[PDB]
PDB file of C-alpha atoms in Angstrom:
ATOM      1  CA  UNK A   1      -0.038   0.265   0.155  1.00 58.57           C
ATOM      2  CA  UNK A   2       1.120   3.265   0.916  1.00 62.73           C
ATOM      3  CA  UNK A   3       0.029   5.519  -0.885  1.00 63.02           C
ATOM      4  CA  UNK A   4       1.298   9.032  -1.842  1.00 63.44           C
ATOM      5  CA  UNK A   5       0.088  11.581   0.517  1.00 61.72           C
ATOM      6  CA  UNK A   6      -0.885  15.048  -1.916  1.00 61.27           C
ATOM      7  CA  UNK A   7      -0.701  18.671  -0.832  1.00 62.56           C
ATOM      8  CA  UNK A   8      -2.248  21.251  -3.826  1.00 62.27           C
ATOM      9  CA  UNK A   9      -2.921  25.044  -3.243  1.00 64.70           C
ATOM     10  CA  UNK A  10      -2.842  28.432  -5.838  1.00 64.96           C
ATOM     11  CA  UNK A  11      -5.262  28.646  -7.946  1.00 64.71           C
ATOM     12  CA  UNK A  12      -8.354  27.072  -8.941  1.00 65.62           C
ATOM     13  CA  UNK A  13     -10.830  28.586 -10.981  1.00 66.48           C
ATOM     14  CA  UNK A  14     -11.163  25.167 -12.738  1.00 63.70           C
ATOM     15  CA  UNK A  15     -11.061  23.200  -9.583  1.00 65.89           C
ATOM     16  CA  UNK A  16      -7.810  22.269 -10.979  1.00 67.53           C
ATOM     17  CA  UNK A  17      -6.398  21.127  -8.082  1.00 66.26           C
ATOM     18  CA  UNK A  18      -8.457  18.843  -7.038  1.00 63.66           C
ATOM     19  CA  UNK A  19     -10.836  19.867  -4.193  1.00 64.26           C
ATOM     20  CA  UNK A  20     -14.108  20.581  -5.374  1.00 65.63           C
ATOM     21  CA  UNK A  21     -14.378  23.253  -4.744  1.00 62.76           C
ATOM     22  CA  UNK A  22     -12.986  26.405  -6.855  1.00 60.37           C
ATOM     23  CA  UNK A  23     -11.654  28.800  -4.289  1.00 61.75           C
ATOM     24  CA  UNK A  24      -7.795  29.686  -4.395  1.00 62.29           C
ATOM     25  CA  UNK A  25      -5.724  28.204  -1.847  1.00 61.74           C
ATOM     26  CA  UNK A  26      -2.888  30.132  -0.220  1.00 57.11           C
ATOM     27  CA  UNK A  27      -1.853  26.879   2.584  1.00 56.11           C
ATOM     28  CA  UNK A  28      -1.330  23.538   1.369  1.00 57.06           C
ATOM     29  CA  UNK A  29      -4.938  21.564   0.881  1.00 56.70           C
ATOM     30  CA  UNK A  30      -4.918  17.905   0.751  1.00 56.58           C
ATOM     31  CA  UNK A  31      -5.692  16.205  -2.244  1.00 60.10           C
ATOM     32  CA  UNK A  32      -7.048  12.796  -2.267  1.00 60.76           C
ATOM     33  CA  UNK A  33      -7.104  10.760  -6.139  1.00 58.71           C
ATOM     34  CA  UNK A  34     -10.844   9.335  -5.709  1.00 56.67           C
ATOM     35  CA  UNK A  35     -11.163   7.306  -2.971  1.00 60.17           C
ATOM     36  CA  UNK A  36      -8.225   5.966  -1.205  1.00 58.84           C
ATOM     37  CA  UNK A  37      -5.879   8.007  -2.575  1.00 61.14           C
ATOM     38  CA  UNK A  38      -2.847   6.591  -5.198  1.00 62.67           C
ATOM     39  CA  UNK A  39       0.699   6.097  -5.574  1.00 63.06           C
ATOM     40  CA  UNK A  40       1.870   9.546  -7.307  1.00 64.64           C
ATOM     41  CA  UNK A  41       4.790   9.475 -10.047  1.00 62.08           C
ATOM     42  CA  UNK A  42       4.798  12.428 -11.196  1.00 60.29           C
ATOM     43  CA  UNK A  43       1.726  15.586 -11.376  1.00 62.42           C
ATOM     44  CA  UNK A  44       1.589  16.927 -14.878  1.00 63.29           C
ATOM     45  CA  UNK A  45       0.378  20.474 -14.453  1.00 62.88           C
ATOM     46  CA  UNK A  46      -1.601  22.662 -17.288  1.00 61.85           C
ATOM     47  CA  UNK A  47      -3.186  26.980 -17.881  1.00 60.77           C
ATOM     48  CA  UNK A  48      -6.287  25.405 -15.465  1.00 60.45           C
ATOM     49  CA  UNK A  49      -6.100  21.510 -15.701  1.00 64.02           C
ATOM     50  CA  UNK A  50      -3.967  19.100 -13.661  1.00 67.21           C
ATOM     51  CA  UNK A  51      -2.886  15.537 -14.564  1.00 66.54           C
ATOM     52  CA  UNK A  52      -1.939  13.187 -12.561  1.00 67.15           C
ATOM     53  CA  UNK A  53       0.517  10.370 -13.390  1.00 66.76           C
ATOM     54  CA  UNK A  54       0.373   6.634 -11.279  1.00 69.68           C
ATOM     55  CA  UNK A  55       3.060   4.051 -11.146  1.00 67.42           C
ATOM     56  CA  UNK A  56       0.406   1.460 -12.498  1.00 68.48           C
ATOM     57  CA  UNK A  57       0.050   3.459 -16.198  1.00 67.46           C
ATOM     58  CA  UNK A  58      -2.773   5.188 -15.442  1.00 65.81           C
ATOM     59  CA  UNK A  59      -3.715   8.731 -15.429  1.00 62.03           C
ATOM     60  CA  UNK A  60      -6.121  11.089 -13.288  1.00 61.48           C
ATOM     61  CA  UNK A  61      -6.853  14.287 -14.340  1.00 62.03           C
ATOM     62  CA  UNK A  62      -8.981  17.346 -13.120  1.00 63.07           C
ATOM     63  CA  UNK A  63     -10.067  20.853 -13.881  1.00 62.32           C
ATOM     64  CA  UNK A  64     -10.544  23.151 -17.155  1.00 61.77           C
ATOM     65  CA  UNK A  65     -12.496  20.477 -19.999  1.00 62.45           C
ATOM     66  CA  UNK A  66     -13.610  23.438 -22.778  1.00 61.51           C
ATOM     67  CA  UNK A  67     -10.369  22.366 -24.876  1.00 61.73           C
ATOM     68  CA  UNK A  68     -10.530  18.570 -24.195  1.00 62.20           C
ATOM     69  CA  UNK A  69      -7.961  18.814 -21.486  1.00 63.71           C
ATOM     70  CA  UNK A  70      -9.247  15.529 -19.868  1.00 62.85           C
ATOM     71  CA  UNK A  71     -12.083  13.636 -21.172  1.00 62.23           C
ATOM     72  CA  UNK A  72     -13.524  13.115 -24.751  1.00 59.95           C
ATOM     73  CA  UNK A  73     -16.486  15.173 -24.281  1.00 60.13           C
ATOM     74  CA  UNK A  74     -16.882  18.738 -26.075  1.00 61.21           C
ATOM     75  CA  UNK A  75     -20.374  19.322 -23.520  1.00 60.23           C
ATOM     76  CA  UNK A  76     -18.038  18.334 -21.082  1.00 60.88           C
ATOM     77  CA  UNK A  77     -16.835  21.819 -19.484  1.00 61.74           C
ATOM     78  CA  UNK A  78     -15.189  21.197 -16.470  1.00 65.80           C
ATOM     79  CA  UNK A  79     -14.043  18.083 -14.679  1.00 66.04           C
ATOM     80  CA  UNK A  80     -15.308  18.524 -10.782  1.00 64.96           C
ATOM     81  CA  UNK A  81     -12.933  15.915  -9.393  1.00 66.88           C
ATOM     82  CA  UNK A  82     -10.522  13.854  -9.493  1.00 70.59           C
ATOM     83  CA  UNK A  83     -11.515  11.281 -12.839  1.00 71.38           C
ATOM     84  CA  UNK A  84      -9.560   8.856 -14.375  1.00 72.94           C
ATOM     85  CA  UNK A  85      -8.353   9.839 -18.092  1.00 70.10           C
ATOM     86  CA  UNK A  86      -8.432   7.285 -20.838  1.00 68.48           C
ATOM     87  CA  UNK A  87      -5.234   6.109 -21.650  1.00 69.73           C
ATOM     88  CA  UNK A  88      -4.739   3.526 -25.043  1.00 72.32           C
ATOM     89  CA  UNK A  89      -1.440   2.060 -22.828  1.00 72.01           C
ATOM     90  CA  UNK A  90       0.089   2.222 -19.367  1.00 73.27           C
ATOM     91  CA  UNK A  91       1.713   5.512 -19.249  1.00 70.53           C
ATOM     92  CA  UNK A  92       5.548   5.919 -18.104  1.00 74.40           C
ATOM     93  CA  UNK A  93       5.559   9.502 -18.868  1.00 76.12           C
ATOM     94  CA  UNK A  94       2.929  12.781 -19.194  1.00 74.55           C
ATOM     95  CA  UNK A  95       3.466  16.811 -20.025  1.00 74.66           C
ATOM     96  CA  UNK A  96       1.303  19.616 -20.387  1.00 73.21           C
ATOM     97  CA  UNK A  97       0.161  22.343 -22.147  1.00 70.80           C
ATOM     98  CA  UNK A  98      -1.879  25.341 -21.868  1.00 72.52           C
ATOM     99  CA  UNK A  99      -4.919  23.365 -22.667  1.00 74.69           C
ATOM    100  CA  UNK A 100      -3.440  19.991 -24.413  1.00 77.52           C
ATOM    101  CA  UNK A 101      -2.035  16.593 -22.586  1.00 76.42           C
ATOM    102  CA  UNK A 102       0.466  14.836 -24.171  1.00 74.61           C
ATOM    103  CA  UNK A 103       1.949  11.019 -22.799  1.00 74.65           C
ATOM    104  CA  UNK A 104       4.224   8.297 -24.065  1.00 74.67           C
ATOM    105  CA  UNK A 105       3.382   4.438 -22.740  1.00 73.05           C
ATOM    106  CA  UNK A 106       5.223   1.198 -22.659  1.00 71.42           C
ATOM    107  CA  UNK A 107       5.446   0.773 -25.579  1.00 71.30           C
ATOM    108  CA  UNK A 108       6.923   4.136 -26.896  1.00 69.95           C
ATOM    109  CA  UNK A 109       3.855   6.236 -28.737  1.00 70.11           C
ATOM    110  CA  UNK A 110       3.566   9.524 -28.055  1.00 71.68           C
ATOM    111  CA  UNK A 111      -0.199  10.199 -27.936  1.00 73.35           C
ATOM    112  CA  UNK A 112      -1.999  14.275 -27.479  1.00 73.02           C
ATOM    113  CA  UNK A 113      -5.032  15.176 -26.653  1.00 71.46           C
ATOM    114  CA  UNK A 114      -6.397  18.892 -26.362  1.00 74.50           C
ATOM    115  CA  UNK A 115      -6.495  22.025 -28.440  1.00 77.33           C
ATOM    116  CA  UNK A 116      -9.942  21.007 -30.332  1.00 75.33           C
ATOM    117  CA  UNK A 117      -8.497  16.972 -29.637  1.00 74.49           C
ATOM    118  CA  UNK A 118     -11.090  15.178 -27.236  1.00 76.46           C
ATOM    119  CA  UNK A 119      -8.875  12.198 -28.535  1.00 75.58           C
ATOM    120  CA  UNK A 120      -6.060  11.068 -27.684  1.00 74.40           C
ATOM    121  CA  UNK A 121      -4.627  10.955 -31.514  1.00 72.55           C
ATOM    122  CA  UNK A 122      -0.751   9.602 -31.897  1.00 73.41           C
ATOM    123  CA  UNK A 123       1.730  12.098 -32.769  1.00 71.11           C
ATOM    124  CA  UNK A 124       4.579  10.637 -34.941  1.00 72.24           C
ATOM    125  CA  UNK A 125       8.250  11.468 -34.281  1.00 75.27           C
ATOM    126  CA  UNK A 126      11.123  10.128 -36.197  1.00 73.11           C
ATOM    127  CA  UNK A 127      13.124   7.233 -33.981  1.00 72.56           C
ATOM    128  CA  UNK A 128      14.637   3.583 -34.143  1.00 70.77           C
ATOM    129  CA  UNK A 129      16.172   3.337 -30.561  1.00 69.30           C
ATOM    130  CA  UNK A 130      12.962   2.579 -29.257  1.00 67.99           C
ATOM    131  CA  UNK A 131      14.045   1.031 -26.244  1.00 64.26           C
ATOM    132  CA  UNK A 132      15.854   3.495 -24.429  1.00 66.85           C
ATOM    133  CA  UNK A 133      14.206   5.814 -22.535  1.00 66.31           C
ATOM    134  CA  UNK A 134      11.647   8.304 -23.985  1.00 63.95           C
ATOM    135  CA  UNK A 135      10.779  11.576 -21.677  1.00 62.55           C
ATOM    136  CA  UNK A 136       8.684  14.277 -22.938  1.00 63.41           C
ATOM    137  CA  UNK A 137       8.633  17.796 -21.789  1.00 61.53           C
ATOM    138  CA  UNK A 138       6.345  20.813 -21.960  1.00 64.93           C
ATOM    139  CA  UNK A 139       5.160  24.224 -21.193  1.00 63.04           C
ATOM    140  CA  UNK A 140       2.614  26.189 -22.634  1.00 60.39           C
ATOM    141  CA  UNK A 141       1.965  26.340 -26.572  1.00 58.29           C
ATOM    142  CA  UNK A 142       5.454  23.947 -27.287  1.00 57.32           C
ATOM    143  CA  UNK A 143       5.698  20.433 -26.651  1.00 56.34           C
ATOM    144  CA  UNK A 144       9.893  17.701 -26.706  1.00 53.01           C
ATOM    145  CA  UNK A 145       9.925  14.256 -26.560  1.00 52.67           C
ATOM    146  CA  UNK A 146      13.795  13.377 -25.846  1.00 55.59           C
ATOM    147  CA  UNK A 147      15.060   9.989 -26.201  1.00 52.51           C
ATOM    148  CA  UNK A 148      18.827   9.063 -25.312  1.00 53.72           C
ATOM    149  CA  UNK A 149      20.623  11.848 -27.277  1.00 56.78           C
ATOM    150  CA  UNK A 150      18.301  12.608 -29.656  1.00 55.58           C
ATOM    151  CA  UNK A 151      15.962  15.173 -29.118  1.00 54.72           C
ATOM    152  CA  UNK A 152      12.179  16.001 -30.669  1.00 55.07           C
ATOM    153  CA  UNK A 153       9.772  18.479 -30.469  1.00 58.41           C
ATOM    154  CA  UNK A 154       6.723  20.467 -32.197  1.00 60.39           C
ATOM    155  CA  UNK A 155       4.305  23.680 -31.974  1.00 59.61           C
ATOM    156  CA  UNK A 156       4.052  27.341 -31.602  1.00 60.27           C
ATOM    157  CA  UNK A 157       7.334  28.968 -33.248  1.00 63.58           C
ATOM    158  CA  UNK A 158       6.931  32.180 -32.984  1.00 61.31           C
ATOM    159  CA  UNK A 159      10.248  33.418 -31.269  1.00 59.48           C
ATOM    160  CA  UNK A 160      12.193  30.784 -33.390  1.00 57.61           C
ATOM    161  CA  UNK A 161      12.340  28.848 -30.692  1.00 57.04           C
ATOM    162  CA  UNK A 162      12.396  25.217 -32.405  1.00 57.93           C
ATOM    163  CA  UNK A 163      13.884  25.017 -35.519  1.00 55.72           C
ATOM    164  CA  UNK A 164      16.522  27.683 -37.109  1.00 54.93           C
ATOM    165  CA  UNK A 165      14.686  29.503 -39.129  1.00 50.80           C
ATOM    166  CA  UNK A 166      11.415  31.679 -38.518  1.00 53.82           C
ATOM    167  CA  UNK A 167       7.413  30.447 -38.274  1.00 53.57           C
ATOM    168  CA  UNK A 168       4.511  30.435 -37.058  1.00 53.82           C
ATOM    169  CA  UNK A 169       3.704  26.930 -36.269  1.00 47.23           C
ATOM    170  CA  UNK A 170       4.577  23.196 -36.562  1.00 48.88           C
ATOM    171  CA  UNK A 171       2.421  20.160 -36.458  1.00 51.91           C
ATOM    172  CA  UNK A 172       5.438  17.759 -37.099  1.00 52.54           C
ATOM    173  CA  UNK A 173       7.956  16.751 -34.513  1.00 55.71           C
ATOM    174  CA  UNK A 174      11.020  17.886 -36.010  1.00 57.29           C
ATOM    175  CA  UNK A 175      14.890  17.294 -34.504  1.00 55.59           C
ATOM    176  CA  UNK A 176      15.830  20.509 -32.597  1.00 55.28           C
ATOM    177  CA  UNK A 177      19.564  19.592 -31.906  1.00 55.74           C
ATOM    178  CA  UNK A 178      22.063  16.445 -31.806  1.00 51.90           C
ATOM    179  CA  UNK A 179      23.842  14.897 -29.921  1.00 50.20           C
ATOM    180  CA  UNK A 180      26.905  14.102 -29.311  1.00 47.59           C
ATOM    181  CA  UNK A 181      27.978  10.555 -27.590  1.00 49.42           C
ATOM    182  CA  UNK A 182      25.991  12.250 -24.595  1.00 48.11           C
ATOM    183  CA  UNK A 183      22.507  11.458 -23.160  1.00 47.87           C
ATOM    184  CA  UNK A 184      20.332  14.179 -22.075  1.00 47.82           C
ATOM    185  CA  UNK A 185      19.064  14.353 -18.678  1.00 45.55           C
ATOM    186  CA  UNK A 186      16.410  17.090 -19.306  1.00 45.70           C
ATOM    187  CA  UNK A 187      14.816  19.565 -21.172  1.00 44.04           C
ATOM    188  CA  UNK A 188      14.144  22.866 -18.533  1.00 47.03           C
ATOM    189  CA  UNK A 189      11.557  24.313 -21.368  1.00 43.73           C
ATOM    190  CA  UNK A 190      10.277  28.339 -20.721  1.00 46.89           C
ATOM    191  CA  UNK A 191       7.035  30.311 -22.623  1.00 49.79           C
ATOM    192  CA  UNK A 192       9.025  31.012 -25.612  1.00 52.63           C
ATOM    193  CA  UNK A 193      12.304  29.398 -24.991  1.00 53.01           C
ATOM    194  CA  UNK A 194      13.937  26.322 -24.621  1.00 51.96           C
ATOM    195  CA  UNK A 195      17.428  24.376 -22.447  1.00 53.55           C
ATOM    196  CA  UNK A 196      19.100  21.702 -22.907  1.00 58.24           C
ATOM    197  CA  UNK A 197      20.761  20.213 -20.274  1.00 59.91           C
ATOM    198  CA  UNK A 198      22.831  16.474 -20.635  1.00 54.86           C
ATOM    199  CA  UNK A 199      23.446  13.748 -17.775  1.00 55.55           C
ATOM    200  CA  UNK A 200      27.040  15.948 -16.908  1.00 57.40           C
ATOM    201  CA  UNK A 201      25.295  18.772 -15.577  1.00 52.55           C
ATOM    202  CA  UNK A 202      26.245  20.300 -18.563  1.00 54.15           C
ATOM    203  CA  UNK A 203      24.320  23.779 -20.987  1.00 57.80           C
ATOM    204  CA  UNK A 204      24.905  21.776 -24.491  1.00 58.56           C
ATOM    205  CA  UNK A 205      21.704  24.052 -26.493  1.00 60.84           C
ATOM    206  CA  UNK A 206      19.306  26.914 -26.012  1.00 62.77           C
ATOM    207  CA  UNK A 207      16.509  28.458 -27.644  1.00 62.10           C
ATOM    208  CA  UNK A 208      15.201  31.901 -29.579  1.00 61.11           C
ATOM    209  CA  UNK A 209      13.921  34.693 -26.855  1.00 60.81           C
ATOM    210  CA  UNK A 210      16.365  34.094 -24.207  1.00 59.14           C
ATOM    211  CA  UNK A 211      15.745  36.140 -20.892  1.00 59.67           C
ATOM    212  CA  UNK A 212      17.824  38.574 -20.874  1.00 60.12           C
ATOM    213  CA  UNK A 213      21.552  38.436 -18.883  1.00 60.29           C
ATOM    214  CA  UNK A 214      21.661  34.514 -19.599  1.00 58.02           C
ATOM    215  CA  UNK A 215      24.443  34.394 -21.985  1.00 56.14           C
ATOM    216  CA  UNK A 216      25.189  30.905 -23.497  1.00 55.19           C
ATOM    217  CA  UNK A 217      28.486  31.349 -23.926  1.00 56.32           C
ATOM    218  CA  UNK A 218      29.974  32.291 -20.535  1.00 58.72           C
ATOM    219  CA  UNK A 219      27.153  29.721 -19.581  1.00 58.64           C
ATOM    220  CA  UNK A 220      28.818  26.133 -21.589  1.00 64.12           C
ATOM    221  CA  UNK A 221      31.396  26.595 -19.156  1.00 63.73           C
ATOM    222  CA  UNK A 222      30.133  25.779 -15.944  1.00 66.46           C
ATOM    223  CA  UNK A 223      29.386  22.385 -14.341  1.00 65.45           C
ATOM    224  CA  UNK A 224      27.475  20.414 -12.303  1.00 63.83           C
ATOM    225  CA  UNK A 225      24.133  22.338 -13.117  1.00 65.59           C
ATOM    226  CA  UNK A 226      20.317  22.173 -12.270  1.00 62.70           C
ATOM    227  CA  UNK A 227      18.678  24.195 -14.906  1.00 64.25           C
ATOM    228  CA  UNK A 228      14.956  25.297 -14.375  1.00 62.84           C
ATOM    229  CA  UNK A 229      12.936  27.716 -16.640  1.00 61.04           C
ATOM    230  CA  UNK A 230       9.827  29.360 -15.306  1.00 58.02           C
ATOM    231  CA  UNK A 231       7.862  31.741 -18.494  1.00 57.21           C
ATOM    232  CA  UNK A 232      10.247  34.485 -18.492  1.00 58.41           C
ATOM    233  CA  UNK A 233      13.246  33.431 -16.394  1.00 57.03           C
ATOM    234  CA  UNK A 234      15.916  30.476 -16.486  1.00 55.06           C
ATOM    235  CA  UNK A 235      17.267  29.671 -12.901  1.00 57.00           C
ATOM    236  CA  UNK A 236      19.936  27.551 -12.060  1.00 54.54           C
ATOM    237  CA  UNK A 237      20.423  25.665  -9.374  1.00 55.52           C
ATOM    238  CA  UNK A 238      24.095  26.433  -7.884  1.00 56.03           C
ATOM    239  CA  UNK A 239      25.074  23.283  -5.024  1.00 56.86           C
ATOM    240  CA  UNK A 240      28.560  25.091  -4.479  1.00 57.10           C
ATOM    241  CA  UNK A 241      27.281  28.581  -3.403  1.00 60.34           C
ATOM    242  CA  UNK A 242      23.650  27.231  -1.972  1.00 57.21           C
ATOM    243  CA  UNK A 243      21.578  29.485  -4.173  1.00 56.01           C
ATOM    244  CA  UNK A 244      19.968  30.285  -7.029  1.00 56.30           C
ATOM    245  CA  UNK A 245      21.007  31.716  -9.844  1.00 55.48           C
ATOM    246  CA  UNK A 246      18.167  33.980 -11.662  1.00 56.26           C
ATOM    247  CA  UNK A 247      18.000  35.724 -15.458  1.00 57.52           C
ATOM    248  CA  UNK A 248      15.461  37.838 -16.903  1.00 54.18           C
ATOM    249  CA  UNK A 249      12.550  40.012 -16.773  1.00 53.74           C
ATOM    250  CA  UNK A 250      11.620  39.539 -13.349  1.00 52.80           C
ATOM    251  CA  UNK A 251       8.244  42.090 -12.494  1.00 51.87           C
ATOM    252  CA  UNK A 252       6.569  39.927 -10.294  1.00 54.62           C
ATOM    253  CA  UNK A 253       9.967  38.610  -8.365  1.00 51.59           C
ATOM    254  CA  UNK A 254      10.960  36.431 -10.240  1.00 52.13           C
ATOM    255  CA  UNK A 255      14.549  36.733  -9.181  1.00 54.04           C
ATOM    256  CA  UNK A 256      15.199  33.881  -6.234  1.00 59.03           C
ATOM    257  CA  UNK A 257      16.553  36.303  -3.649  1.00 60.14           C
ATOM    258  CA  UNK A 258      20.474  37.588  -3.931  1.00 62.88           C
ATOM    259  CA  UNK A 259      20.492  37.189  -0.252  1.00 62.43           C
ATOM    260  CA  UNK A 260      22.217  34.476   1.473  1.00 64.99           C
ATOM    261  CA  UNK A 261      20.914  31.123   2.676  1.00 62.23           C
ATOM    262  CA  UNK A 262      20.418  29.555   6.255  1.00 63.14           C
ATOM    263  CA  UNK A 263      20.366  26.107   5.300  1.00 63.15           C
ATOM    264  CA  UNK A 264      20.941  23.640   2.161  1.00 64.61           C
ATOM    265  CA  UNK A 265      19.138  23.275  -1.538  1.00 61.67           C
ATOM    266  CA  UNK A 266      17.554  19.916  -0.912  1.00 61.03           C
ATOM    267  CA  UNK A 267      15.474  20.518  -3.765  1.00 59.82           C
ATOM    268  CA  UNK A 268      13.955  23.253  -6.178  1.00 56.39           C
ATOM    269  CA  UNK A 269      11.197  23.090  -8.988  1.00 59.30           C
ATOM    270  CA  UNK A 270       9.722  26.232 -10.606  1.00 59.78           C
ATOM    271  CA  UNK A 271       5.892  26.494 -12.169  1.00 57.64           C
ATOM    272  CA  UNK A 272       4.629  29.060 -14.776  1.00 56.42           C
ATOM    273  CA  UNK A 273       5.535  32.447 -13.030  1.00 58.67           C
ATOM    274  CA  UNK A 274       6.653  30.913  -9.467  1.00 57.82           C
ATOM    275  CA  UNK A 275       9.543  28.761  -7.788  1.00 59.38           C
ATOM    276  CA  UNK A 276       9.061  26.780  -4.848  1.00 57.17           C
ATOM    277  CA  UNK A 277      12.478  26.275  -3.192  1.00 59.70           C
ATOM    278  CA  UNK A 278      13.245  23.121  -0.857  1.00 61.69           C
ATOM    279  CA  UNK A 279      15.407  23.209   1.980  1.00 63.41           C
ATOM    280  CA  UNK A 280      17.002  20.880   5.018  1.00 67.82           C
ATOM    281  CA  UNK A 281      16.653  21.785   8.307  1.00 70.98           C
ATOM    282  CA  UNK A 288      13.308  18.593   9.118  1.00 70.25           C
ATOM    283  CA  UNK A 289      11.994  20.010   5.561  1.00 70.79           C
ATOM    284  CA  UNK A 290      10.894  23.090   4.706  1.00 71.87           C
ATOM    285  CA  UNK A 291       8.686  24.419   1.290  1.00 74.57           C
ATOM    286  CA  UNK A 292       9.533  27.342   0.393  1.00 71.68           C
ATOM    287  CA  UNK A 293       7.846  29.767  -1.741  1.00 73.32           C
ATOM    288  CA  UNK A 294       9.145  33.181  -4.530  1.00 75.24           C
ATOM    289  CA  UNK A 295       7.476  34.901  -7.799  1.00 77.49           C
ATOM    290  CA  UNK A 296       4.121  35.581  -9.239  1.00 78.70           C
ATOM    291  CA  UNK A 297       2.120  35.019  -6.226  1.00 80.24           C
ATOM    292  CA  UNK A 298      -0.865  35.674  -6.619  1.00 80.95           C
ATOM    293  CA  UNK A 299      -3.321  32.664  -6.657  1.00 79.47           C
ATOM    294  CA  UNK A 300      -1.835  32.298  -2.827  1.00 77.57           C
ATOM    295  CA  UNK A 301       0.730  29.495  -5.188  1.00 75.28           C
ATOM    296  CA  UNK A 302       3.108  31.575  -3.283  1.00 74.86           C
ATOM    297  CA  UNK A 303       1.775  31.611   0.230  1.00 73.35           C
ATOM    298  CA  UNK A 304      -0.543  33.711   2.253  1.00 75.68           C
ATOM    299  CA  UNK A 305       1.507  36.876   1.144  1.00 74.35           C
ATOM    300  CA  UNK A 306      -0.355  37.388  -2.289  1.00 74.95           C
ATOM    301  CA  UNK A 307       1.106  40.175  -2.605  1.00 73.50           C
ATOM    302  CA  UNK A 308       4.182  39.224  -4.117  1.00 74.16           C
ATOM    303  CA  UNK A 309       6.489  40.517  -2.759  1.00 75.53           C
ATOM    304  CA  UNK A 310      10.089  39.767  -3.148  1.00 75.09           C
ATOM    305  CA  UNK A 311      12.239  36.603  -1.001  1.00 74.48           C
ATOM    306  CA  UNK A 312      10.996  33.197   0.729  1.00 72.50           C
ATOM    307  CA  UNK A 313       7.839  33.025   2.957  1.00 75.23           C
ATOM    308  CA  UNK A 314       7.276  29.341   4.692  1.00 74.56           C
ATOM    309  CA  UNK A 315       4.893  27.824   3.126  1.00 74.49           C
ATOM    310  CA  UNK A 316       4.927  24.294   5.265  1.00 73.83           C
ATOM    311  CA  UNK A 317       7.446  21.955   6.806  1.00 68.43           C
ATOM    312  CA  UNK A 318       7.873  18.349   6.930  1.00 69.53           C
ATOM    313  CA  UNK A 319       9.755  14.717   8.057  1.00 71.01           C
ATOM    314  CA  UNK A 320      10.402  13.465   5.259  1.00 71.03           C
ATOM    315  CA  UNK A 321      11.915  14.694   1.546  1.00 73.34           C
ATOM    316  CA  UNK A 322       8.827  15.764   0.004  1.00 73.25           C
ATOM    317  CA  UNK A 323       7.978  16.143  -4.207  1.00 72.78           C
ATOM    318  CA  UNK A 324       7.539  19.863  -5.376  1.00 68.77           C
ATOM    319  CA  UNK A 325       5.673  20.364  -8.946  1.00 72.85           C
ATOM    320  CA  UNK A 326       4.997  23.853 -10.164  1.00 75.36           C
ATOM    321  CA  UNK A 327       1.991  24.922 -12.278  1.00 76.12           C
ATOM    322  CA  UNK A 328       0.007  27.560 -13.635  1.00 76.98           C
ATOM    323  CA  UNK A 329      -0.114  29.737 -10.866  1.00 75.98           C
ATOM    324  CA  UNK A 330      -0.355  26.510  -8.010  1.00 74.48           C
ATOM    325  CA  UNK A 331       1.766  24.196  -6.052  1.00 76.22           C
ATOM    326  CA  UNK A 332       1.457  20.519  -5.569  1.00 75.66           C
ATOM    327  CA  UNK A 333       3.427  19.062  -2.942  1.00 75.80           C
ATOM    328  CA  UNK A 334       3.913  14.838  -2.350  1.00 74.04           C
ATOM    329  CA  UNK A 335       5.470  13.084   0.660  1.00 75.90           C
TER     330      UNK A 335
END
């Protein structure tokens, strides 16, 4: 047994917190998927909907359904509580856009629903390894599928983030970057930018519309970095200096407090426009950035600094979303 203990707070206009009600929360609220809960592997957050992947490959979701984010029904404008999302095969990875949801099954296939599509339509990405590791990432209007060394993606190419030539929209996924005798760890994505990070902890490739201050040239010499991106900012977890280097036009305190920290950082996570910090003491969880919907805590004035939102006995897994915050024990 041993189910996951999920806490959720922040934007709740479409009941995307899975609490049943539509009230914006400033304090962590216990979110339980159906009866007797479930074991959570990862939480993918959309614009106004939430998706939760279990260890057995099943999906559960709640939130806006006016664009076909969750259920296959034009009449169903909103999913009230945690309801099972139909999948063609056991899901091993999940991601979400503004009004879309993509998955990766055990067979390796990529399926996408939302944005007008109420059925999981298969996305054809070019590959020939089939049995390495197919991970998927997404943000706003862009998705990225990563397998070993290859990195593919589709969606909006307005700020020239998907391909070298400028464009408008790409439906069929293309190769955005290729290594190189080194596997790609993850891909930190922004609203209109992208950062590719390898397993060595180095920055290998970036995309169009990079935030001010962030220069690709002087950052590719760095070793052992954890890259996290919001919509208009890039954040670097510096374990040696015990801080978070922030770059970008941060009007709503998106910039991590330059003031020296107190406790060692054991986790950093970002949402659409807010950051979530986890330090070790007991484990404390902090939040900074654009927290109007209470996604940063009781203080919804979006003031700079770090405010405590919870203290836990064990190390929590943290997921960020569009003005939402997820804490999993």
